[PDB]
Structures are given as structure tokens and as C-alpha cells.
Amino acid sequence: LNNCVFSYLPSYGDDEVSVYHPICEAALNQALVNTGLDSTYEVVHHELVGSIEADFVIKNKQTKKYLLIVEVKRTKSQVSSTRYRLQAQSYVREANIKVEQHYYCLTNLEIIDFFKHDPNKPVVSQQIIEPSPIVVGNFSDTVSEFYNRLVEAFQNIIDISVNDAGTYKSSTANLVDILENRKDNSTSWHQALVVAGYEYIRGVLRGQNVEVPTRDAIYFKSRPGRLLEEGRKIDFNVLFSEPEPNTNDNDIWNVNLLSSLNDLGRRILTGDELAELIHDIATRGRGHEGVVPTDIELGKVLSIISQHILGRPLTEDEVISDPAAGSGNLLATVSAGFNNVMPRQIWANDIETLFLELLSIRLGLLFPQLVSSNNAPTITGEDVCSLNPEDFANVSVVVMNPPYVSGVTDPAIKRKFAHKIIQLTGNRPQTLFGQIGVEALFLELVTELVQDGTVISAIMPKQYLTAQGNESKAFREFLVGNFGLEHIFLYPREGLFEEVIKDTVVFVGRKGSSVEEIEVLDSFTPLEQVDLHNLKRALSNSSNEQIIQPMGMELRKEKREELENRVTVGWRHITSNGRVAEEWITNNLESHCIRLVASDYDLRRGRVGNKGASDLLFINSKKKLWDLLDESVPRDWLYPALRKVNEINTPIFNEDATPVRFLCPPNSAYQDGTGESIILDKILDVYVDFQVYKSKQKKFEKSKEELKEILYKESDFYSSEHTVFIPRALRRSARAFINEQKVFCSTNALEVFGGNSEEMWLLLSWLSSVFAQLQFEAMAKDQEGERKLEKKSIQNLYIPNLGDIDDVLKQDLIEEVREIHFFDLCRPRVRKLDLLWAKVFWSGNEMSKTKEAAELLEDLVFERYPEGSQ
Numbered sequence: 036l037n038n039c040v041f042s043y044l045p046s047y048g049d050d051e052v053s054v055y056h057p058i059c060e061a062a063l064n065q066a067l068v069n070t071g072l073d074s075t076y077e078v079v080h081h082e083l084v085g086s087i088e089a090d091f092v093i094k095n096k097q098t099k100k101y102l103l104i105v106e107v108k109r110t111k112s113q114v115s116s117t118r119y120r121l122q123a124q125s126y127v128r129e130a131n132i133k134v135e136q137h138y139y140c141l142t143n144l145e146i147i148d149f150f151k152h153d154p155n156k157p158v159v160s161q162q163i164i165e166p167s168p169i170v171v172g173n174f175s176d177t178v179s180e181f182y183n184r185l186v187e188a189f190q191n192i193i194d195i196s197v198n199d200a201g202t203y204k205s206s207t208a209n210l211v212d213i214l215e216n217r218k219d220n221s222t223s224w225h226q227a228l229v230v231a232g233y234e235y236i237r238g239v240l241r242g243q244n245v246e247v248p249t250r251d252a253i254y255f256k257s258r259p260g261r262l263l264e265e266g267r268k269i270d271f272n273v274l275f276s277e278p279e280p281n282t283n284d285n286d287i288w289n290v291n292l293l294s295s296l297n298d299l300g301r302r303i304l305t306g307d308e309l310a311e312l313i314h315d316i317a318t319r320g321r322g323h324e325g326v327v328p329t330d331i332e333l334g335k336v337l338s339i340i341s342q343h344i345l346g347r348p349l350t351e352d353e354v355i356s357d358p359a360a361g362s363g364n365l366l367a368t369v370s371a372g373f374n375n376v377m378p379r380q381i382w383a384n385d386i387e388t389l390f391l392e393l394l395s396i397r398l399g400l401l402f403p404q405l406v407s408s409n410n411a412p413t414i415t416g417e418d419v420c421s422l423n424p425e426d427f428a429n430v431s432v433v434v435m436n437p438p439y440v441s442g443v444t445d446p447a448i449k450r451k452f453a454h455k456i457i458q459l460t461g462n463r464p465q466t467l468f469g470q471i472g473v474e475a476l477f478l479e480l481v482t483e484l485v486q487d488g489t490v491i492s493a494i495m496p497k498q499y500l501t502a503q504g505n506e507s508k509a510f511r512e513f514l515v516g517n518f519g520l521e522h523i524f525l526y527p528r529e530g531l532f533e534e535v536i537k538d539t540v541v542f543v544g545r546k547g548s549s550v551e552e553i554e555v556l557d558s559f560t561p562l563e564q565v566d567l568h569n570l571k572r573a574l575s576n577s578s579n580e581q582i583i584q585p586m587g588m589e590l591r592k593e594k595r596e597e598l599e600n601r602v603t604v605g606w607r608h609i610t611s612n613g614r615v616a617e618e619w620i621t622n623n624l625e626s627h628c629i630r631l632v633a634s635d636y637d638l639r640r641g642r643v644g645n646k647g648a649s650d651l652l653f654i655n656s657k658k659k660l661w662d663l664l665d666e667s668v669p670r671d672w673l674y675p676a677l678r679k680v681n682e683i684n685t686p687i688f689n690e691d692a693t694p695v696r697f698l699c700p701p702n703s704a705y706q707d708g709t710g711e712s713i714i715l716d717k718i719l720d721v722y723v724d725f726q727v728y729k730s731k732q733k734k735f736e737k738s739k740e741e742l743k744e745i746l747y748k749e750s751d752f753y754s755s756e757h758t759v760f761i762p763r764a765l766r767r768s769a770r771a772f773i774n775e776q777k778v779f780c781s782t783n784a785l786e787v788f789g790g791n792s793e794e795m796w797l798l799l800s801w802l803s804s805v806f807a808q809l810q811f812e813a814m815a816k817d818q819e820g821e822r823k824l825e826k827k828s829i830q831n832l833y834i835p836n837l838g839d840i841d842d843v844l845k846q847d848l849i850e851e852v853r854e855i856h857f858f859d860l861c862r863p864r865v866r867k868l869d870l871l872w873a874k875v876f877w878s879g880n881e882m883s884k885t886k887e888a889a890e891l892l893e894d895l896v897f898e899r900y901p902e903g904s905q
């Protein structure tokens with residue numbers, strides 16, 4: 036009977052996992068029972084698929100293959116969004132051979148969109164399957180009717196998937212086609228959007244009991260000028276402008292397509308569907324791109340933060356602006372969070388004129404009860420460098436996801452922004468130093484353009500927080516200057532093939548202010564899990580003394596003086612990433628480990644080559660000397676050596692690991708009469724002559740007698756079998772190695788010794804894991820550039836209790852070392868070695884705790900050394 040156990044339907048602001056997921060899960064299960072497919076298929080919540088986690092999969096019990104992937108979102112605008120449709124599609128691409136059928140689904144429960152991934156036709160809107168979009172209802176509906184309809188829709192979708200009976204929606208496809216062919220013709224592009232938009236707008240508005248002109252577009256086919264006038268009576272001036280459609284248009288006067296668009300409007304009741312569809316096609320000369328991909332969850336949080344920095348109500352004359360509006364998603368989301376805004380207070384601008392219509396459509400239908408011929412958003416298609424302070428006079432809040440170009444700045448773009456800033460301020464840009472990015476110039480230009488007190492919220496690459504180039508230094512100077520930084524928001528973002536990523540940040544300023552303490556807001560939780568009601572109240576209750584933390588987040592305060600004085604070095608000190616990692620290590624690793632210093636092992640800095648004559652000790656390190664000497668040195672006098680920690684690149688430190696050699700003559704080479712002493716005399720002779728050759732005065736004083744003694748001494752600093760070596764300085768590779776035979780090590784590495792073969796290989800296996808590396812990055816929480824750790828800090832590393840690993844596993848752990856290289860710290864990946872080690876610490880859950888360490892490591896490394904991720 037579909038008996039519902041739920042008392043309420045969600046609110047858009049409810050935590051997705053806590054509130055939406057149980058409803059969706061109960062419905063999927065019921066759908067399997069109703070059709071009797073529960074004998075064959077199971078519902079799995081949070082299914083790990085490669086490096087990502089799916090909200091729901093319908094999974095075959097016997098084969099473990101995927102019938103259907105279901106991704107849940109909170110809002111209708113999210114379901115319409117190409118970004119989130121690509122995220123859902125990604126699960127099918129990541130599952131590949133584990134797939135039964137290529138069907139996937141995106142839903143906020145109110146609306147279900149149903150798709151079939153086809154690798155030979157990857158464009159999302161080409162993949163919508165009939166009868167999407169399925170309108171289940173609205174969250175203000177009676178729960179039981181709504182729940183029943185949810186169950187029936189899932190039943191339909193499951194039946195179609197299991198039989199591979201899906202059919203691609205043709206109208207969507209026909210409209211995509213029409214627009215793709217008009218992309219390079221602004222006249223016909225616009226003409227198509229006039230007709231299509233008229234029909235879609237009328238559907239959205241009629242479904243919401245808003246009065247619309249009663250005649251359908253096709254009625255005006257012979258008099259299209261009338262279509263323009265009929266549209267203007269609703270609003271959307273920039274859409275309902277010239278040029279008129281042509282009567283002779285071979286594509287747009289199609290009853291089927293036009294009805295379909297009107298119906299689509301009736302179904303969605305939002306401007307989002309059509310706007311996203313247009314944006315996909317228009318944004319094909321990409322880019323067009325900005326700092327982050329579409330993030331509606333972020334936009335919702337930004338809205339709350341903006342209002343809190345504003346610190347007062349927005350009056351009726353005050354405007355909310357996005358000067359590089361793009362798709363309109365961010366402006367639409369942020370605007371919607373201001374109760375009582377009028378359509379006339381929203382201003383969207385973008386240089387790309389192909390976005391004009393879609394911006395009109397999205398933002399005009401945003402407030403469907405209010406939009407009219409006298410009350411509509413302003414939509415402009417101007418380069419920011421053409422705008423003037425007067426254009427921003429009424430602007431009280433700016434939000435932006437500024438243009439970003441992942442590569443090398445176009446100098447003509449650079450110049451165009453710089454001149455405009457010079458013109459406005461009389462001075463060069465505060466940000467234009469080093470290898471400038473357009474995003475910083477854009478932000479600075481907008482800042483100069485607005486009035487004091489204007490709230491400016493900008494999404495920026497996180498590198499700006501922590502990087503040490505002159506461009507990041509100048510940027511932080513800008514932030515605590517004119518920009519009037521008040522708030523820093525740190526959050527995790529979602530990627531196509533990566534669950535969480537901390538590579539972006541939000542900077543919120545109030546122009547011309549100089550607040551004493553700057554807010555730092557850190558979300559430990561993905562933004563979909565943030566209860567928006569809790570956050571609203573946490574920010575506005577946080578008085579002077581008592582700082583109230585929102586759930587899954589920490590709010591802290593930093594003194595401006597501290598950021599001002601730490602502008603060259605960076606603001607890494609403000610992030611919590613190092614603290615949580617220290618906590619994670621303590622709650623998960625410490626009980627089963629001991630500190631290296633407590634253990635039986637000895638620690639010692641590499642001894643070789645500390646007291647000069649490096650070029651002789653490492654006979655083959657210098658090419659010109661070696662071109663001379665190579666024919667003169669017996670191969671068995673050469674021992675594998677470490678000078679620069681860089682030259683090894685493998686866990687096994689032997690002759691095959693490195694070409695670098697140390698010169699160790701045998702004992703008989705030092706006594707007189709033998710042939711060995713002869714061989715050595717020859718060598719030293721040629722060495723002396725080359726030192727002359729290199730000398731400007733053709734002089735070298737030091738005798739063979741002395742060189743003999745140095746070589747004899749340094750020979751005694753060899754490293755015993757099964758030493759494990761720790762580089763003192765690393766950039767990007769997780770480096771640790773072991774030797775099997777006698778080697779020589781420079782001062783550039785730390786030596787660990789004392790154990791036996793097995794104890795030593797196990798320690799190497801540990802050092803090669805994400806867990807040991809995590810600990811290193813934690814000790815280095817206050818560093819930039821290379822990670823430099825000496826005996827002092829490494830003494831304190833936690834190493835696993837020897838008597839805690841089972842003998843089979845010990846054998847698996849050592850073995851695994853034999854089949855790895857050095858993992859990339861900027862992009863760690865969970866692998867057998869880590870999972871193996873995970874068995875020592877956890878029964879629940881190996882994968883998920885190993886996946887956490889990996890993510891924490893990645894985030895810490897991104898702070899210390901960004902460039903490895905670009």
C-alpha cells in the first residue's frame with residue numbers, strides 16, 4: 036500500500052543526508068518490492084565507485100553489477116544543472132565494466148530526471164530519457180500522496196532500466212540541434228530564443244497561476260513583431276527585443292517543439308531548465324569558465340554570509356550585482372536568499388552576449404509572482420572594463436565567480452584591465468605583480484568601481500591564502516587594504532572524479548573597512564549536509580564574547596594585525612587542516628603505535644661528504660671529471676651512493692636505483708707495493724690535473740697523501756645492510772628507501788637503523804604509506820614550499836607496534852613494498868599497501884578510514900605545495 040513512516044517532507048535547507056536520503060531510500064526499496072525485483076536487486080546507500088561515492092545504486096545481488104545510479108540534490112535548480120548532471124553521469128563512467136545498464140538519475144524528490152549514458156554521445160542534454168522530467172510534486176504537498184507518487188516514478192524508472200527500454204527525449208535534442216547551428220550567428224540565435232523563450236516562460240508562469248498572454252507563439256508566425264510586444268507585456272525586455280523572428284525560419288515554427296517547451300515550463304516552474312540548456316551550447320568556445328564549476332550549495336551559503344557581513348537590511352533602492360554572471364546560477368541563488376527582494380534590484384552583467392537571453396529567462400522567472408513590465412532584473416552584456424563607478428552607484432552587494440584561465444594569462448587582457456585601473460585610481464594595480472591571474476585583476480577592478488561599504492564576495496583559488504609568489508603576496512595586501520576583508524570561508528567542493536576537494540576559498544570584504552578581527556569560517560562537512568537554518572542562526576547569535584559554532588563547522592576570529600604582518604609568508608596559520616589531522620592521528624593511530632624515539636631504533640644524519648672534496652668522493656657526480664676518470668677506476672671500487680636525495684626514485688637503494696657512485700678503494704690500495712695502490716695513484720693523478728685545468732691560476736696544492744687520507748676516512752661512513760633512509764627535504768614525492776648492500780649517504784638524508792631485515796622492511800612499508808606521510812605533513816603544518824623535517828621532528832613519528840601485525844600480513848606488507856614507486860603527495864590514491872596497513876588499525880572500516888587519511892593528506896599538501904596539482 037506504500038505505507039509511509041515519514042511525518043514531514045524536507046525543506047530545501049535541510050541536511051541532505053539526514054533528511055532527503057531516508058525518504059529516497061524507503062521509496063527505492065518500496066519500488067523494488069512493488070515490482071518483485073527485490074529478489075534480484077538491492078538498494079545500496081553510499082556505494083563506493085572507484086574514487087567516488089554514489090548516493091544510491093540499484094545493484095544486482097548475484098552479479099554485483101549496477102542497474103541504476105541515483106544522485107540526490109536538494110533544489111530543483113540543482114536537478115536542472117548541467118554540472119550536477121555531469122556529476123551523476125560520472126558514476127556510470129567510473130563504474131564502466133561494473134555496469135549492467137547505463138542508466139542514471141538526478142533528483143531532489145520533487146523532480147526526477149532520468150538519463151542513459153552513451154559514451155559515443157556524451158553531451159548531457161542528448162541523454163535525457165522519456166518521460167523526464169518526472170514531476171513527483173512539491174514539498175508543501177500532503178506527505179502520503181507525494182510519497183506514493185515518488186514510489187510509482189521510481190517503479191517506472193526501474194522497469195525501463197531493467198528492460199533497456201529507454202527512449203531519448205526528442206524535443207530537447209531538436210532544440211539543442213537548432214541552437215548548435217546558430218551559435219555563430221547572433222541574429223538567428225536570438226530569433227530562436229525569442230520564440231522558444233516565449234513558450235517556456237508562459238508555461239512556467241501559467242503553472243504558477245500568473246496571468247500570461249493567451250495566444251501561443253505559432254499564432255504570430257505571420258506577424259512576429261507581435262510576439263515581441265506580447266512578450267514585453269510579461270517582461271524580459273532583453274529577450275523581447277529586435278531582431279524579430281522571421282516568418283520563413285525553417286526550424287523554430289514547429290508546433291511539436293513549441294508545445295514541448297511550454298509543457299517543460301509547466302513541469303519545472305523555474306527558469307533553470309531552459310537557461311542551463313542554452314548555457315551548455317553557448318559556453319562551447321570555453322571558456323567562458325570561472326574559478327569554480329557551478330556550485331549552487333556554495334551560492335546558498337554565500338547568501339547567508341553576505342547578509343551577515345552587510346549587517347543590516349537591504350533597502351528597496353539597493354542592487355545585488357554579478358558583473359560576470361555567466362549562467363546566472365550564483366546570482367539567482369544568492370538573490371533568492373534575501374527575503375523581500377524585488378526583481379528590479381538584481382543586475383546581471385556578462386561580456387558574453389550569447390548569455391543575454393538565458394540570464395533574462397533565469398532571473399526573470401526567479402520571482403514569478405513579482406516579475407512584470409515595471410519590475411524586472413537588469414541584464415547587460417558589457418565588458419567590465421567599459422563600466423564606470425556610476426553604473427555601480429546603487430550596488431550594495433556584489434557576488435562573483437571571476438573568470439579564471441588555467442594556463443598563461445593573455446597579455447592583451449592583462450593590459451586592458453591594468454589601464455582601466457590606472458585610469459580610475461591614478462595608480463598601477465595593487466595585484467599586478469609576478470605572474471598575474473585575470474581573476475585578481477577582475478576583483479580589484481570591481482572593488483575600485485564600487486562605493487565604500489559595498490559587500491564584495493568573491494570565490495578565489497585557495498593558493499592565494501598560502502602561496503609565496505609575489506602575485507599572492509600582492510593579493511593578500513589588496514585584501515587587507517581597500518578590499519576591506521571581513522570574512523574568509525573555507526569549504527570542501529565536489530569534483531567529477533573526486534568526492535571532496537579543498538582548492539577554492541571565499542573572500543568577503545566590505546569596501547573601505549578595517550575591522551579589528553576577521554572571521555574565519557571552516558566547514559568540515561560537505562555543503563549539502565549543512566542545515567541552512569542552523570547556519571543563519573549561528574552567525575547572528577555570535578556576539579562579542581560568545582562565539583556559537585554551527586554544526587559541522589567552526590567559526591574562529593583572527594586579528595587583522597596578524598594577517599597584515601604575515602602577508603609575504605602567507606595565511607596557512609588560519610586553516611584548521613593541520614589541527615584536524617593531528618586529531619585524526621591521535622584518535623586512530625596512536626594506541627597501536629609507538630614514537631620512533633621510544634622504539635629500539637637509532638637515528639643519524641648521513642655522514643658522507645661533509646668536510647669537502649665532494650667531487651672526489653662522488654667520483655661520477657660531475658660529468659667533465661668523469662669523462663676523464665671513468666676508464667681509470669675499477670668498477671668494484673664504485674659503491675652506490677646518495678648525494679642529492681632526488682637521484683633515487685625507488686624503494687630499493689642498490690646499483691640499479693641510481694648511476695651515482697662513491698669511490699671506496701680497498702684496504703690494500705693504501706699499503707705500498709701492491710697493484711691496488713698503483714691503480715689509485717693513477718686515479719688521484721688525473722684528479723689533480725683536472726683540478727689544475729679548472730683552476731684559473733693552474734694550481735692545486737693538496738697532495739695525494741692527503742686525498743688518500745680523506746678517502747680512507749669517509750670510507751668508514753658506509754651504511755650497513757638494511758638501513759632505511761629518510762630525506763630531510765621533499766617537494767612532491769613520498770620518499771623513503773632501503774639498501775641491501777653497502778652504500779654511502781650524504782648529509783641530505785636521515786638514517787634509521789638497529790632492527791633486523793624484517794623489522795626494517797616493515798618500517799619502510801610504513802613510511803611508504805599514506806599514514807606515515809600524513810604524519811609528516813602534520814608536523815610540517817606551518818611550512819611553505821618543500822617539506823623540511825630533521826631528527827628533532829621525525830623522532831616523534833608514530834610507528835606501528837611490531838607485536839600487532841599477524842605473520843601472514845607482515846609477509847603481505849613487505850611483499851607490497853617490492854611493487855611500488857614513490858606516490859605523488861599532491862594526488863594520493865588509496866592502494867593495496869594502504870589497505871593492507873589499514874587491517875592493523877581498523878575492523879571498521881578499512882576503505883573509508885584509508886580514504887580519509889588520503890583526503891586529509893591531499894588537503895595538507897595542497898596548502899604547502901599547490902603547483903603539484905596544476
Ligand SMILES: Nc1ncnc2c1ncn2[C@@H]1O[C@H](CSCC[C@H](N)C(=O)O)[C@@H](O)[C@H]1O
Nearest residue numbers: 324325359361362363364365386387419438
Ligand atoms: N573580461 C570580462 N568582463 C566581464 N565578464 C567576463 C570577462 N571575462 C569573462 N567574463 C565572464 O566571466 C564568467 C565566469 S563565471 C562563470 C559563471 C557561472 N556559470 C555562474 O553561475 O556564476 C564567464 O561567463 C565569462 O563570460
Ligand SMILES: [Mn+2]
Nearest residue numbers: 090106107108
Ligand atoms: Mn547528493
